[PDB]
Ligand binder design. Sequence first.
Ligand SMILES: [Zn+2]
Ligand SMILES: [Zn+2]
Ligand SMILES: [Zn+2]
Ligand SMILES: [Zn+2]
Ligand SMILES: [Zn+2]
Length: 328
Amino acid sequence: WHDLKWPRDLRPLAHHDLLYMGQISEDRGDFNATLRNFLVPRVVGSQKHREVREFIVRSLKDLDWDVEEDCFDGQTPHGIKPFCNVIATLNPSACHRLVLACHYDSLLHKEGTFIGATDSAVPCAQLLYLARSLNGKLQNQKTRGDGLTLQLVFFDGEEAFERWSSHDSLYGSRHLAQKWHEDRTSAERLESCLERSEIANQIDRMEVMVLLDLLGAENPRFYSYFGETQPVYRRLVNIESRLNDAGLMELPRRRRRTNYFSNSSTVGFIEDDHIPFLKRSVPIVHIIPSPFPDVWHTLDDNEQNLHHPTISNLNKIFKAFVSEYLQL
Ligand SMILES: [Zn+2]
Ligand SMILES: [Zn+2]
Ligand SMILES: [Zn+2]
Ligand SMILES: [Zn+2]
Ligand SMILES: [Zn+2]
């Protein structure tokens, strides 16, 4: 009951695949094409928000993923609002899901039009970019019958309408967590669960949720925010280290290394889309910088303040991480 091992043995990415995940050569224009669709105000209930959702759904339906639009109405300080989570699953029958998540709504800012380029246009784009860039390998992985799949969740209504409170925020995530907790299931209904796993409902199928937010500014610092997922987090540290050793990271000068993923833990908690899951025992890795970028919730969280080299470096880490976890 001390030092419980991660339930899935984590096999290090082959040098071959590392070197391959780590050259985002000319991908580059493809990522930016994706991102431009998100660099618009995406306020809840707005037309542009509707359109971003349609772009997400279609991008993933086109890659033959199972896509569910989980729409519902909820009460806010601004009245009743329609919300719509997007849940995409590569192989719906697989018992276990590696879940990558972000929110696609943008903050309603008092002072003017807010783009939320790091929050979370970039993360949204990174999830679609991972799905597209790894499609070939994911489609092959899907037919192994090994009981693991990739699942992407684009939450709606993360942002508070007024002052952040338990009542005013995380509308999409609170809704989804409860729903999946109440929707009962078991191993016998599913494809190839791990041997002595305890599945009683849909939320138990989330093996780990990796939540991305506030990405795209220069030089983020990440820490392990949860002891529970330290074995998963350590894989990001190791991947980043291997990418630097292979000289595959974009840096301003030679003889520099990236050090985004600190090999320490931090004493800090961040009120976010992972919480209602945390209460239901879903292990969480929160990929969010500490401290937040300086542009956080300002009108300067915009396209021009994004840092291309950092974004391409993060993309390499994430592609390598998904490849290693799913053994692509
Ligand atoms: Zn003890
Ligand atoms: Zn629902
Ligand atoms: Zn925000
Ligand atoms: Zn956010
Ligand atoms: Zn957090």
